[PDB]
Coordinates of C-alpha atoms and ligand atoms in Angstrom, one line a residue:
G1 CA 41.6 -17.6 134.7
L2 CA 43.5 -14.3 135.8
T3 CA 47.3 -12.9 135.5
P4 CA 48.7 -9.8 137.2
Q5 CA 48.7 -8.1 134.2
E6 CA 44.6 -8.0 133.7
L7 CA 45.0 -5.9 137.1
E8 CA 47.9 -3.7 136.0
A9 CA 44.8 -2.3 133.1
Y10 CA 43.1 -0.9 136.0
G11 CA 45.5 0.7 137.8
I12 CA 46.6 -1.9 140.0
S13 CA 50.7 -2.9 140.3
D14 CA 52.8 -5.2 142.3
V15 CA 50.1 -7.9 142.8
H16 CA 51.9 -10.2 145.1
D17 CA 48.9 -12.8 144.6
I18 CA 45.5 -13.3 143.1
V19 CA 42.5 -15.3 144.6
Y20 CA 40.4 -15.6 141.5
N21 CA 36.7 -17.0 142.2
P22 CA 37.6 -18.8 145.9
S23 CA 35.0 -21.4 146.4
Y24 CA 33.3 -21.5 149.8
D25 CA 35.7 -24.2 151.3
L26 CA 38.7 -21.4 150.7
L27 CA 36.9 -18.6 151.9
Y28 CA 35.8 -20.3 155.3
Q29 CA 39.3 -21.3 155.7
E30 CA 40.5 -17.8 154.8
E31 CA 38.0 -16.5 157.2
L32 CA 38.9 -18.5 159.8
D33 CA 42.6 -18.1 159.6
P34 CA 44.0 -17.4 163.5
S35 CA 46.5 -14.7 162.3
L36 CA 43.5 -12.3 160.7
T37 CA 43.1 -9.1 163.0
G38 CA 40.7 -6.4 163.1
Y39 CA 37.7 -6.2 160.8
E40 CA 38.7 -9.0 158.5
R41 CA 38.6 -11.7 161.2
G42 CA 35.8 -13.9 161.5
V43 CA 34.3 -16.1 164.3
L44 CA 32.6 -19.5 163.9
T45 CA 29.3 -19.8 165.5
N46 CA 27.8 -22.9 166.8
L47 CA 25.4 -22.8 163.4
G48 CA 28.3 -23.6 161.5
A49 CA 28.3 -20.1 159.8
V50 CA 30.7 -17.4 160.1
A51 CA 29.9 -14.0 161.7
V52 CA 31.8 -10.8 160.5
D53 CA 32.2 -7.4 161.6
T54 CA 32.0 -4.4 158.9
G55 CA 33.2 -1.9 161.2
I56 CA 31.9 1.8 161.9
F57 CA 29.6 1.1 159.0
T58 CA 26.6 -0.9 159.7
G59 CA 24.6 0.2 156.8
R60 CA 24.5 2.2 154.0
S61 CA 26.1 5.7 153.8
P62 CA 23.7 7.6 150.6
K63 CA 25.8 10.6 151.7
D64 CA 28.9 9.5 150.4
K65 CA 27.3 8.0 147.1
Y66 CA 28.5 9.8 144.1
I67 CA 28.1 9.6 140.3
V68 CA 30.6 11.3 137.7
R69 CA 29.2 13.6 135.7
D70 CA 30.4 13.5 132.3
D71 CA 29.0 13.2 128.7
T72 CA 27.5 9.7 129.3
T73 CA 25.4 10.8 132.4
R74 CA 25.0 14.5 132.2
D75 CA 21.7 14.1 130.3
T76 CA 20.2 10.7 131.2
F77 CA 21.0 10.7 135.1
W78 CA 18.3 12.2 138.2
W79 CA 21.0 14.6 139.4
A80 CA 20.2 15.6 143.3
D81 CA 20.9 19.3 142.2
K82 CA 19.3 19.1 138.9
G83 CA 16.1 17.1 139.0
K84 CA 13.0 17.7 141.2
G85 CA 12.6 15.7 144.4
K86 CA 15.4 14.7 147.0
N87 CA 18.0 11.7 146.0
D88 CA 21.4 10.9 146.6
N89 CA 22.7 11.1 143.0
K90 CA 25.4 13.7 143.6
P91 CA 27.5 15.0 140.9
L92 CA 31.2 14.3 140.9
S93 CA 34.1 15.5 138.7
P94 CA 36.0 13.4 136.5
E95 CA 39.4 14.8 138.2
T96 CA 37.8 14.1 141.8
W97 CA 36.9 10.6 140.4
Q98 CA 40.6 10.1 139.0
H99 CA 42.1 11.0 142.8
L100 CA 39.8 8.6 144.4
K101 CA 40.7 5.9 141.8
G102 CA 44.0 6.7 142.7
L103 CA 43.6 6.0 146.4
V104 CA 41.9 2.9 145.5
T105 CA 44.1 1.2 143.3
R106 CA 47.5 2.5 145.5
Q107 CA 45.8 0.6 148.1
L108 CA 45.1 -2.4 146.5
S109 CA 48.6 -2.7 144.9
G110 CA 50.9 -4.6 146.4
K111 CA 48.6 -6.9 148.2
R112 CA 47.2 -10.4 147.9
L113 CA 44.0 -9.4 145.8
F114 CA 40.5 -11.8 145.5
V115 CA 38.7 -11.5 142.5
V116 CA 35.1 -12.8 142.1
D117 CA 33.7 -12.7 138.6
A118 CA 29.9 -13.0 138.6
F119 CA 26.5 -11.9 137.0
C120 CA 24.1 -9.7 137.8
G121 CA 20.9 -10.4 136.1
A122 CA 19.7 -13.9 135.1
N123 CA 19.1 -13.5 131.6
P124 CA 22.3 -13.4 129.4
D125 CA 20.8 -10.9 126.9
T126 CA 20.6 -8.1 130.0
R127 CA 22.8 -9.4 132.1
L128 CA 26.1 -7.5 133.6
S129 CA 29.3 -9.4 134.0
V130 CA 31.0 -7.9 137.0
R131 CA 34.7 -8.3 138.2
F132 CA 34.5 -7.6 142.0
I133 CA 38.6 -7.0 143.5
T134 CA 38.8 -6.8 147.2
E135 CA 41.7 -7.6 149.6
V136 CA 39.5 -8.6 152.5
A137 CA 38.1 -12.1 152.3
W138 CA 34.5 -11.9 154.0
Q139 CA 33.9 -9.2 151.2
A140 CA 34.2 -11.7 148.5
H141 CA 32.4 -14.2 150.3
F142 CA 29.4 -11.5 150.5
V143 CA 29.9 -10.8 146.4
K144 CA 30.0 -14.9 145.7
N145 CA 26.9 -15.4 147.7
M146 CA 24.7 -12.1 146.6
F147 CA 25.5 -12.2 142.9
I148 CA 25.2 -15.0 140.5
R149 CA 28.2 -17.4 140.2
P150 CA 29.3 -18.7 136.8
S151 CA 29.9 -22.1 135.5
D152 CA 33.6 -23.3 134.3
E153 CA 32.0 -22.8 130.9
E154 CA 30.7 -19.0 131.4
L155 CA 34.1 -18.1 133.3
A156 CA 36.1 -19.2 130.1
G157 CA 34.3 -16.6 128.2
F158 CA 34.2 -13.8 130.8
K159 CA 34.6 -10.3 129.9
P160 CA 33.7 -7.4 132.4
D161 CA 31.1 -5.0 131.8
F162 CA 31.7 -3.3 135.2
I163 CA 34.2 -3.6 137.5
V164 CA 33.9 -2.7 141.2
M165 CA 37.2 -2.1 143.4
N166 CA 36.6 -2.3 147.3
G167 CA 39.3 -0.1 149.1
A168 CA 37.5 -0.1 152.4
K169 CA 40.8 -0.1 153.8
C170 CA 41.5 3.7 152.6
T171 CA 40.0 7.0 153.1
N172 CA 40.3 9.9 151.0
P173 CA 42.1 12.9 153.6
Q174 CA 41.8 15.4 150.7
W175 CA 37.6 15.3 150.8
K176 CA 37.3 18.6 152.2
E177 CA 39.4 20.8 149.8
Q178 CA 37.4 18.4 147.1
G179 CA 33.9 19.4 148.5
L180 CA 32.7 16.1 149.4
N181 CA 30.6 14.9 152.6
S182 CA 33.3 12.9 154.3
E183 CA 36.5 11.1 154.1
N184 CA 34.5 8.1 152.9
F185 CA 33.4 7.4 149.0
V186 CA 30.9 5.3 146.9
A187 CA 31.6 6.6 143.6
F188 CA 30.3 5.4 140.0
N189 CA 31.9 6.3 136.8
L190 CA 29.7 4.8 133.6
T191 CA 32.1 6.0 131.1
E192 CA 35.2 3.9 132.6
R193 CA 32.1 1.6 133.9
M194 CA 33.4 1.1 137.6
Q195 CA 32.9 1.8 141.5
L196 CA 35.0 2.8 143.9
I197 CA 34.5 2.0 147.4
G198 CA 36.4 3.7 150.1
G199 CA 36.2 3.9 154.0
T200 CA 33.3 1.8 154.4
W201 CA 33.4 -1.8 155.0
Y202 CA 29.7 -2.8 154.7
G203 CA 29.1 -5.2 151.8
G204 CA 25.6 -3.7 151.2
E205 CA 27.4 -1.0 149.1
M206 CA 28.6 -3.2 146.5
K207 CA 25.0 -5.0 146.4
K208 CA 23.2 -1.8 146.1
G209 CA 25.4 -0.2 143.9
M210 CA 25.0 -2.7 141.2
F211 CA 21.3 -2.4 141.8
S212 CA 21.7 1.2 141.2
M213 CA 23.2 0.7 138.0
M214 CA 20.4 -1.8 136.6
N215 CA 18.1 0.6 137.6
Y216 CA 19.8 2.9 135.4
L217 CA 20.4 0.5 132.5
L218 CA 17.0 -1.5 132.2
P219 CA 14.5 1.3 132.1
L220 CA 16.4 3.0 129.3
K221 CA 15.7 -0.6 127.6
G222 CA 11.9 -0.8 128.4
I223 CA 12.6 -3.4 131.0
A224 CA 11.3 -2.7 134.8
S225 CA 14.1 -2.8 137.3
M226 CA 12.5 -3.6 140.6
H227 CA 12.9 -3.4 144.4
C228 CA 11.0 -6.4 144.8
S229 CA 10.9 -9.9 146.3
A230 CA 9.2 -12.8 143.9
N231 CA 7.7 -16.2 144.1
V232 CA 5.5 -18.7 141.9
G233 CA 2.9 -21.1 142.7
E234 CA 2.3 -24.5 141.3
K235 CA -0.1 -23.3 138.7
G236 CA 2.9 -20.7 137.2
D237 CA 0.9 -18.0 138.8
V238 CA 3.8 -15.3 139.8
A239 CA 3.8 -12.5 142.7
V240 CA 6.1 -9.6 143.0
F241 CA 6.3 -7.6 146.9
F242 CA 7.4 -4.2 146.6
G243 CA 8.5 -2.3 149.7
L244 CA 11.1 -0.9 151.6
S245 CA 13.7 -2.0 154.1
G246 CA 12.4 -3.9 156.8
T247 CA 8.5 -4.2 155.6
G248 CA 8.7 -8.1 155.0
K249 CA 9.9 -8.4 151.3
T250 CA 11.9 -11.4 152.3
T251 CA 9.9 -12.7 155.6
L252 CA 6.8 -12.9 153.2
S253 CA 8.1 -14.3 150.0
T254 CA 10.0 -17.0 151.7
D255 CA 6.9 -19.2 151.7
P256 CA 7.5 -23.0 151.9
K257 CA 4.2 -23.5 149.6
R258 CA 5.4 -21.4 146.8
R259 CA 8.7 -21.5 144.8
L260 CA 11.0 -18.4 145.7
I261 CA 12.6 -16.2 142.3
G262 CA 14.3 -14.0 144.3
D263 CA 14.0 -11.5 147.8
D264 CA 15.1 -8.0 146.7
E265 CA 16.0 -7.3 143.2
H266 CA 13.9 -7.9 140.1
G267 CA 13.5 -7.1 136.2
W268 CA 10.6 -7.6 133.9
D269 CA 10.9 -7.9 130.3
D270 CA 9.0 -9.4 127.4
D271 CA 9.4 -12.9 128.8
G272 CA 8.7 -11.9 132.6
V273 CA 10.2 -11.3 136.1
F274 CA 13.8 -12.1 136.7
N275 CA 16.2 -11.9 139.6
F276 CA 19.4 -9.8 139.6
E277 CA 20.9 -11.8 142.6
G278 CA 22.6 -15.6 143.3
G279 CA 21.5 -15.1 147.3
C280 CA 19.4 -13.8 150.1
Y281 CA 20.5 -11.2 152.7
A282 CA 17.9 -11.5 155.5
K283 CA 17.4 -9.6 158.5
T284 CA 18.4 -11.4 161.5
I285 CA 17.3 -8.8 164.3
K286 CA 15.1 -10.4 166.9
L287 CA 15.0 -13.7 164.5
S288 CA 13.0 -16.7 165.8
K289 CA 13.2 -20.1 164.3
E290 CA 9.4 -20.7 165.1
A291 CA 8.4 -17.7 162.8
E292 CA 10.7 -18.0 160.1
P293 CA 12.3 -21.2 159.7
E294 CA 13.2 -21.2 156.5
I295 CA 15.6 -18.6 157.0
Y296 CA 16.7 -19.8 160.2
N297 CA 17.7 -23.0 158.8
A298 CA 19.3 -21.0 155.9
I299 CA 22.1 -20.1 158.3
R300 CA 24.7 -22.9 158.1
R301 CA 28.0 -22.9 156.6
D302 CA 28.7 -20.6 153.7
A303 CA 26.0 -18.6 155.3
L304 CA 27.9 -15.2 156.5
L305 CA 26.4 -13.4 159.5
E306 CA 27.3 -9.8 160.0
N307 CA 27.2 -7.7 163.3
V308 CA 25.0 -10.4 165.2
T309 CA 26.1 -10.9 168.6
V310 CA 28.1 -14.1 169.4
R311 CA 28.8 -15.4 172.9
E312 CA 31.5 -17.0 174.0
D313 CA 30.5 -20.3 173.8
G314 CA 29.6 -19.4 170.2
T315 CA 25.8 -19.2 170.2
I316 CA 24.5 -16.6 168.8
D317 CA 22.2 -13.8 170.4
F318 CA 19.7 -12.8 167.6
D319 CA 18.0 -10.0 170.0
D320 CA 21.0 -8.2 170.5
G321 CA 20.8 -4.7 168.5
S322 CA 23.4 -3.0 171.1
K323 CA 25.7 -2.7 167.6
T324 CA 22.9 -2.6 165.4
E325 CA 19.1 -3.4 164.5
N326 CA 20.6 -4.1 161.0
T327 CA 22.2 -7.3 161.7
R328 CA 22.3 -9.4 158.3
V329 CA 22.9 -12.9 156.8
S330 CA 23.9 -13.4 153.1
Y331 CA 23.7 -16.8 152.1
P332 CA 23.5 -18.6 148.3
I333 CA 20.1 -19.2 147.4
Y334 CA 20.0 -22.5 147.2
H335 CA 20.4 -22.8 151.3
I336 CA 16.4 -22.2 150.6
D337 CA 14.9 -25.6 149.6
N338 CA 11.9 -24.5 147.7
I339 CA 13.1 -22.2 144.9
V340 CA 13.1 -21.6 141.2
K341 CA 16.4 -23.2 139.4
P342 CA 18.2 -23.7 137.5
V343 CA 18.0 -20.1 136.4
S344 CA 15.8 -17.7 138.8
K345 CA 13.1 -16.4 136.4
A346 CA 9.3 -17.1 135.5
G347 CA 6.8 -15.8 133.7
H348 CA 4.8 -12.3 134.0
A349 CA 3.6 -11.3 137.5
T350 CA -0.3 -11.0 137.7
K351 CA -0.2 -10.1 141.5
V352 CA 1.6 -6.9 142.6
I353 CA 1.8 -6.6 146.3
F354 CA 3.1 -3.1 147.8
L355 CA 4.2 -3.5 151.4
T356 CA 4.1 -0.3 153.8
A357 CA 4.9 -0.7 158.0
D358 CA 2.4 2.0 159.1
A359 CA 3.8 3.7 162.1
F360 CA 0.8 6.0 162.4
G361 CA -1.4 2.6 162.7
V362 CA -4.1 4.2 160.2
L363 CA -3.8 1.9 156.9
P364 CA -5.4 -1.5 156.9
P365 CA -4.2 -4.7 156.6
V366 CA -4.9 -5.1 152.9
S367 CA -6.7 -2.9 150.4
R368 CA -6.8 -3.9 146.6
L369 CA -5.9 -1.0 144.6
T370 CA -7.4 0.9 141.3
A371 CA -5.0 1.6 138.6
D372 CA -4.7 5.2 139.7
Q373 CA -4.1 4.3 143.4
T374 CA -1.7 1.6 142.0
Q375 CA 0.0 4.4 140.2
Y376 CA -0.1 7.3 143.0
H377 CA 1.0 4.7 145.9
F378 CA 3.9 3.3 143.8
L379 CA 5.2 7.0 143.5
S380 CA 4.8 7.9 146.7
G381 CA 6.4 5.0 148.5
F382 CA 5.1 5.3 152.0
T383 CA 6.4 4.0 155.0
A384 CA 6.9 4.8 158.8
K385 CA 9.4 3.8 161.1
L386 CA 8.3 3.9 164.9
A387 CA 11.8 5.8 165.7
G388 CA 12.6 8.1 168.3
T389 CA 14.8 5.4 169.9
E390 CA 11.6 4.3 171.7
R391 CA 12.9 5.6 174.8
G392 CA 10.6 9.0 174.6
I393 CA 7.0 7.7 174.5
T394 CA 6.0 7.5 170.8
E395 CA 7.6 8.8 167.3
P396 CA 6.1 7.3 164.3
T397 CA 8.0 8.9 161.9
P398 CA 7.6 8.5 158.1
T399 CA 9.3 8.1 155.0
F400 CA 8.0 8.8 151.3
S401 CA 10.7 6.8 149.0
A402 CA 9.6 6.9 145.5
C403 CA 8.9 3.0 143.7
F404 CA 9.5 2.3 147.4
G405 CA 13.7 2.2 146.7
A406 CA 14.4 5.8 146.0
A407 CA 18.0 5.4 147.2
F408 CA 18.6 3.1 144.4
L409 CA 16.9 4.9 141.3
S410 CA 19.1 6.1 139.1
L411 CA 16.6 7.8 136.4
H412 CA 13.1 10.2 137.4
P413 CA 10.5 7.8 139.8
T414 CA 8.0 8.2 136.9
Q415 CA 10.1 6.6 134.1
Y416 CA 10.0 3.5 136.4
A417 CA 6.2 3.9 137.2
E418 CA 5.8 3.9 133.2
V419 CA 7.5 0.8 132.4
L420 CA 6.0 -1.2 135.6
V421 CA 2.5 0.2 134.5
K422 CA 2.9 -1.2 130.8
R423 CA 4.0 -4.6 132.3
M424 CA 1.4 -4.6 134.7
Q425 CA -1.3 -4.2 132.0
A426 CA 0.1 -6.3 128.9
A427 CA -0.3 -9.4 132.0
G428 CA -3.3 -8.1 133.7
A429 CA -1.7 -7.9 137.1
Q430 CA -3.4 -6.3 139.8
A431 CA -2.1 -4.4 142.9
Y432 CA -2.9 -4.8 146.6
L433 CA -1.9 -2.5 149.6
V434 CA -0.2 -4.3 152.6
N435 CA 0.1 -2.8 155.8
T436 CA 2.8 -5.3 158.1
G437 CA 2.8 -2.2 160.3
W438 CA 1.1 -1.2 163.0
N439 CA -2.5 -0.6 164.1
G440 CA -4.3 1.1 167.2
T441 CA -3.1 -1.8 169.6
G442 CA 0.7 0.1 169.5
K443 CA 1.9 -3.2 168.4
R444 CA 3.1 -4.6 165.3
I445 CA 0.6 -6.9 163.2
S446 CA 1.9 -10.7 163.6
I447 CA 3.9 -12.3 160.9
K448 CA 1.1 -15.3 161.4
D449 CA -1.7 -13.1 160.3
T450 CA 0.4 -11.3 157.4
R451 CA 1.1 -14.3 155.8
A452 CA -2.6 -15.6 155.8
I453 CA -3.5 -12.4 154.2
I454 CA -0.9 -12.9 151.4
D455 CA -2.5 -16.5 150.7
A456 CA -5.9 -14.5 150.7
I457 CA -4.6 -12.4 147.9
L458 CA -2.4 -15.3 146.0
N459 CA -5.3 -18.0 145.9
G460 CA -7.9 -14.6 145.3
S461 CA -9.9 -15.1 148.5
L462 CA -9.6 -11.2 148.5
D463 CA -10.5 -10.6 144.8
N464 CA -13.9 -12.4 145.7
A465 CA -14.7 -10.6 148.8
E466 CA -17.3 -8.1 149.2
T467 CA -15.6 -4.7 149.8
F468 CA -16.5 -1.4 151.3
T469 CA -14.6 2.0 150.7
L470 CA -12.3 3.5 153.4
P471 CA -13.0 7.1 154.1
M472 CA -10.1 9.6 153.2
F473 CA -7.6 6.8 151.8
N474 CA -10.8 5.8 149.6
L475 CA -9.3 2.2 150.0
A476 CA -11.7 -0.9 149.0
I477 CA -11.1 -3.0 152.3
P478 CA -12.4 -6.9 152.6
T479 CA -15.4 -7.1 154.8
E480 CA -14.2 -10.3 155.8
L481 CA -11.2 -12.8 154.9
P482 CA -10.5 -16.7 155.2
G483 CA -7.9 -17.3 158.1
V484 CA -7.8 -13.6 159.2
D485 CA -9.3 -12.1 162.5
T486 CA -12.1 -9.8 161.2
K487 CA -11.6 -7.2 164.0
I488 CA -8.3 -6.1 162.3
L489 CA -9.5 -5.4 158.6
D490 CA -11.0 -2.3 159.3
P491 CA -8.2 0.1 161.1
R492 CA -11.1 2.0 162.9
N493 CA -11.5 -1.4 165.0
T494 CA -8.5 -1.5 166.7
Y495 CA -9.1 2.1 168.3
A496 CA -11.0 2.7 171.4
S497 CA -13.0 5.0 169.2
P498 CA -12.8 5.6 165.5
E499 CA -12.1 9.1 166.3
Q500 CA -8.8 8.4 167.3
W501 CA -7.9 7.1 164.0
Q502 CA -9.7 9.9 162.5
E503 CA -7.3 12.5 163.9
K504 CA -4.3 10.0 162.9
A505 CA -5.6 9.6 159.2
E506 CA -5.9 13.5 158.6
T507 CA -2.4 13.6 159.7
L508 CA -1.3 11.0 157.3
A509 CA -3.5 12.2 154.5
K510 CA -1.9 15.8 154.8
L511 CA 1.6 14.2 154.5
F512 CA 0.8 12.3 151.6
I513 CA -1.1 15.0 149.5
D514 CA 2.1 17.2 151.2
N515 CA 4.8 14.7 149.6
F516 CA 2.6 14.1 146.1
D517 CA 3.2 17.8 145.2
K518 CA 6.4 17.4 143.6
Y519 CA 4.6 15.0 140.7
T520 CA 2.1 17.9 139.8
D521 CA 4.1 19.5 137.3
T522 CA 2.8 17.3 134.7
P523 CA -0.8 16.2 133.7
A524 CA -0.1 12.6 134.4
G525 CA 0.7 13.5 138.1
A526 CA -1.7 16.1 138.3
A527 CA -4.2 13.6 137.4
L528 CA -3.4 10.9 139.8
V529 CA -3.9 13.6 142.8
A530 CA -7.9 12.2 142.6
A531 CA -6.4 8.7 143.2
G532 CA -4.4 9.8 146.6
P533 CA -6.4 11.1 150.0
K534 CA -8.7 13.7 150.3
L535 CA -9.9 15.5 153.6
Ligands
LIG601 N1 3.6 -8.9 159.9 C1 4.9 -9.1 159.3 N2 5.3 -9.2 158.3 C2 6.7 -8.8 158.0 N3 7.4 -8.7 158.4 C3 7.4 -8.6 159.7 C4 6.4 -8.4 160.4 N4 6.3 -8.7 161.9 C5 7.6 -8.4 162.1 N5 8.6 -8.6 161.1 C6 9.7 -8.1 161.0 O1 10.2 -7.2 159.8 C7 11.1 -7.7 159.4 C8 11.1 -7.4 157.5 O2 12.2 -7.7 157.3 P1 12.3 -7.9 156.2 O3 11.3 -8.9 155.3 O4 14.0 -8.5 155.9 O5 12.3 -6.8 155.0 P2 12.5 -6.5 153.8 O6 13.3 -7.3 152.7 O7 11.6 -5.5 153.2 O8 14.1 -5.2 154.0 C9 11.7 -8.5 159.8 O9 12.9 -8.8 160.7 C10 10.5 -9.2 160.2 O10 11.3 -10.6 161.1
LIG602 MG1 15.1 -8.4 152.4

């Protein structure tokens, strides 16, 4: 248990009341308190879960992310103004950090705080003991769902390695004089081992902020830190799925025939793949209980819906994206029946799948990758949003995010590729490229067909299939696969003429070649150029 004195050490004073590690029951009662007003206020939906509103911020704010440049982080961090390649690791002075800290601690002073102690990492030897402090009940609920909930025995000897203070209600009015992006802030200090959040209510900032910390600590110890989902079959076969947001990591790893290890952040050490989290954070936009039953059923009491539209009668309108297309729901991992327990970990991965939502409709549904192409595509981290608000006519805008999660990388991309490659090699892991995106029909490939391709990969149907090489990208695509429509395996078939495909394939190839040029500093990246597309 905590005391007002342990908080005073953090710089927080006059603490009225501490709600230490609240149970789901209390949180439920706290969120439904009819006296709550504003963004703290939750509503009860017909499914039994409470729905909240994160306010103005319905997603992350990378432009407000800062890391203090001191003697601990100077020579190790991948700085946005130092290292080649664009990133969000903006340097912050120790003095400006102290100003932001003052703003947050004064904000949490004289309040009734919610303190949640949890773990980030399923293995005791590499895990972080994090202490979350907030004045908003649903934020404590979010960290309870997302992080690893300690047992009574573990809380007994609990010593926080990292502290995260959420001062969402406060903003920095001096930001203009200090040279920051805005009045908001998501700052990190590795000397003090702390995270400060101000102005933004979005819970994703606490989750991804700790992921960014694991992404810094782990690789330096020779452990792969990955933005991937993961599951194991009955035979002990572990599969990992990399990919950016909305590409299918969550919808595809939640397979009723395989034990879910995790859905978003995993490490890979000598023993194998381990989850960092204690829950799942699924996307609910246009959620169908028919296509994704396990995820739909995980939405019940204790799950936390965010930004979804709740009608007057309590029913949820999952199709409504008027506020945001990034509607979410977090829930304890146990809301999914088929999962690995008690500890979310398994053996080494032998199947590495890179998911990509190709808006250009150029990439094939599935391709077996060569060792060089694995490394080339990992560092490229391609995805394409069919943006332009789709009120214009067409706009397949691409995104090249190194390691399929550049937004959370604390070290140079190659450091991630390196530890990952050595792990894949010791395990004899195979890599595959999967397009959960578009083809020539202008429609996204159905979840049904994608799941069939994932099955073909996991059971070796793909590995034994006869394959031919796709021009330019030089991808080995299967001639056919059991359960999947043969017409779609070759992307050129979905076009009226293979000449239509050709045009776009060249455009995408140039984008890839242009993008990869920022890795041709070393003989390694220069060597991998032969693994990329050629016109
Ligand atoms: N063929 C498909 N494969 C995977 N996801 C698909 C597919 N078609 C549509 N989707 C939708 O795309 C989104 C993928 O989201 P999710 O798995 O949550 O992304 P990630 O976990 O990688 O951010 C979901 O909203 C899902 O319903
Ligand atoms: Mg996900």
